[PDB]
């Protein structure tokens, strides 16, 4: 499934309006209102070859607490250059491509943004080659990508979540799959490492780094607490539970998972985490296909990436997934007030006997 | 919604074959082969006003361990009589209705069967009335429903999971929402109580019983280990995790949840439990609407039941949901060999740092 | 380097006797006396297509403590059947092949024996396929191989070290590279797991198991304390140091490492461990080449195995390596009395400032 | 003693294919021989010292250019008998070292090293304080230190000169210290002897104590270099601690006698290089030392097998120098491969420091 576009587009395209609405209410939860974005921004989306989608999660008004509306952006992009390209050229091209989408998002009120797992480099862990695929790794706190992202952080006052490949040089020049998060002031709020490594098939990610010892950090931004969940950490519900225990409100899931079986798990695990943790969850997956001069046994290509980035809400509602082929950006108008309103009504934490479950 | 039929039927009805197949592969996982059931059995399904669906989960052949094929049946039925009816008449009518479907299932190789939560009585916890809605409760180990089920257990050699309303009389005549499981020999293998009580809206189930102290029992049958998960226990993933820790292979979820928000959670929580526990999970929900002479504030009706019973597999594949209106029976050809094959490949248990999380 | 035979044979074959003796004294330490083995046993070695080598380590007589002479055997064997064969047939063939060599060793006074890493199954971690290469794994405490080894333990009263692939079923059916050690009474003295996993090239061993949590166990036999060091644990000197700290006297190193770079490290790391720990170290590597129907990217073959099994001594002396092509058995007459005699003279433990090194 | 280096004998006897296979088994990989000036080789023939040049190959890095550093290792005998005036012996050794330095300077060498206490014959065996402790002077201000600084600032080569520091400011006590001067001739540091071999002829404990300096690492303009004294070679923990502080090229000036130590010579240094992913150099003096008096573990001090060599993090080593004639080895180090193999072979990371050091 590569040529086929997003599920929502096909369903809207074929079945009639009443049946379409019923299928929407069964699959995507509730028909949330589409975010009213500036028209010219949409024109820019048409010009820059990326799809723009805006949705707003509705919340129940609280007489004592005003809603803390936070606009959240999710960027899924392909590699504009082939994998067999110089590191500097690829990094610069990806920086420009990300910057254009950031410029389009900045004129829409977005406050937090996120990119796919290791957006600065093509996913080359399959080839099991240390050179030159480990040359993309640099120091997370001081790298060209980190400074470039800090440039975009302090001009558009948006929190940027940039997953990278941290080359931990102070402790023996070892690579780590770390996702740095910078505030709107461009000062590195933290760097979450990869807790879980997928040792399956093409995912030969164990031969490049080890499991992250950072644990489950939660980064506090001026808008709201945000966490980062790496690709393979998505599968384990305990990871999401631990992230939500520390108070994380918006959990992002930058991933670079291939199609097929993982495509079926994509609308399931993140939604279940959001439902069972009462915290907004975001799902990010890169689009396109990666080609390599060499072949790897689980071929020149690295399969197809279905993308389909979406954001789930604590009230079982989800944004429609983005297109599976074209790169794009999703703008979700989060209302964190509903996060704890549903948490109180559905006391899954309390009715969940932590003493009876965590102990055994 | 109520009139609208199952999602699979509508999708097959409208979008063309290539798009339908792609949507199937996105939603229902993989296109598993339809179970080859006897033709005359299908005719019986047409005659007895219940839908029959057969699906077979494929598994990877193991050179050392032969596949342990277990056929599993899931029965979702409405109440054939109105709620404001004598207890004996309603119980007898439900016994006959269940027995007919059991007779149809017995000629299809089924080994384990399950019914909706408290199939013997209409869900009346909303009315918050002790009489006569607590009169349906009897002793789980010795009741008319238990003996009737044991009659069906020892003639068709099928494991029967009958959720009932246990009236625990030896310890003060208190009701409990317990689901007795009898073997193929008709001898009460156990009775799992309700660990979680939904204190939400129409679900005024807290004013009838307390949380079950039985914990998380796993019943060992000659075919395979099976557990029972009550309606509200479905929501909490920790319940499914604890059930799968004790070695349960096929976890059933008899529920009587109303439509709307719960309909969205229906294809999500059970599938996620199956994926994150590498054990087959079954989902059962009663069909139809229940009407009462009295009104209750969260009305005469008790909303609509979307049914849509399905079985999920450890390899992210699920059977298509049953029809949302007509009562029916689903026959799933489970292959437990794939349960541990995917568990080994996806070491979610091992890569899941129990020391770092449970502590 | 496949056709070429053992280094010692070539050196003896070409250079004259004085130069050969000088090269021996430079490379193999001291010219230790060859063990006097029964002649008919040698005939059996000729008949059963395996090479037999006997060497005796000399020790200084102690007036108060009599020497605790322990004969040690090291078996290196190929796979007699192709890898693409039924599991039962391959296991039975390997059992018979190992049993024949054990029968030949039993008539030579051997007390402890060891086999290559996972001798029951061909090394197939390169293919990265779960089936049917994980079907060889069984329960370590109760398996066909374990019971078969216990049969050979209690009839020839020899301690058997059988590296296997433990399928830990009681805790979720997970494979582990464990090496069970049974006493002369045939009762499972312990099972050491694999502490270090080589995530390099063809060694795709990380996609089959995790690092062993067993730590560094030392098994006490009626003859002497013995430890087991898995393939990749050989490289790290800290592993050998920790094994020697717990009192281990004879440390075995069953490995299945491929040729080339590892061949250069073979005579280095084990000898250095023996010298810096004052404990006898044994090195075991399987011989032959493994062929697979499928190809794997770091081909049908799994390279060549140089074998060259040898035993090192605390006094910087080593047994000559076995032949690189033909499977064989080495019988070393260990004298543990010299182990602590050299330890006292060379107080590397004491002159090694543990407070100044381990603390930092 | 008469027998020459192992490599020469092997090349001399076995045929080319077998020789190449033995090379690939023993010396790792057949690294390319360094292309040295022809006239320099002529000088090596004239000055009665052997010159050997080898170049360690490294994988090209698109982002980091290779930091090629030429390293020299000088092994020399004592040109005068041990029973000689201190000044005459020191001057003769200065001239002999200076000639080899002049030959090395026209080959691009940046760092050089000498045998342990090259300024004085090894006389710790005799257990006599006089006149064998008269060779000791102040490390920071001595005739040998100033002479070495003269050679440092004219050929811009880092010089590692092991000496016998007479620590006079703290009670006139001798120490076996190895001063390292930069290319600007300014004493970068002085590493003391951490480990003392109290074995047999090595009666080195009756002359000094264990060095309290710890494990210093000297930073030169070319690269970080450490000094490992003779007995510190045996303990792998010493090399591990040196490599922990970031040392890239670890030198091992030693004056160990033949026999058992000859077997440990190609083993311990290579294992340290492999398990630390840092270039290691091994230096041992050549020749035999004779004394008028006899010592019980004789007039002679055994034979010195020399055989100086440099090991690399990728398990490759330079062939050992001749065991009889003094010589100089020029190794073209490429430090870029040092961390390339370190990353691939994460012995540091896969080495559970928490599980071992604790």
Numbering used by the authors:
A (entry chain A), C (entry chain B): 3 to 300, 307 to 368
B (entry chain D): 3 to 300, 307 to 367
D (entry chain C): 4 to 300, 307 to 367
What are the paper's exact sentences on this?
βUP in higher eukaryotes are nitrilase-like enzymes that use a tetrad of conserved active-site residues for catalysis of the CO–N bond cleavage. Substrate activation of human and rat enzymes is accompanied by a shift in their respective oligomer equilibria towards larger assemblies, which for HsβUP are primarily homooctamers.
Only the latter sample resulted in micrographs that were of sufficient resolution and contained enzyme states larger than the dimer. Nevertheless, 3D classification showed that the sample was heterogeneous, consisting of tetramers, hexamers, and octamers. Map 1 has a resolution of ~3.0–3.5 Å for the two central HsβUP dimers, and >6 Å for the “outer” dimers, indicating that the latter region shows more variability. Out of the 384 amino acids comprising the HsβUP subunit, residues 3–300 and 307–368 are visible in the density map. In the cryo-EM structure reported here, the entrance loops as well as the N-terminal extension adopt conformations basically identical to those observed in the crystal structure of DmβUP. EL1 and EL2 are completely ordered, and EL3 partially. The lack of density for at least six residues at the very tip of this loop is indicative of their dynamic mobility. In the inner subunits involved in dimer–dimer interface formation, the last visible residue before the gap in density is H307, which was targeted in the here reported site-directed mutagenesis studies.
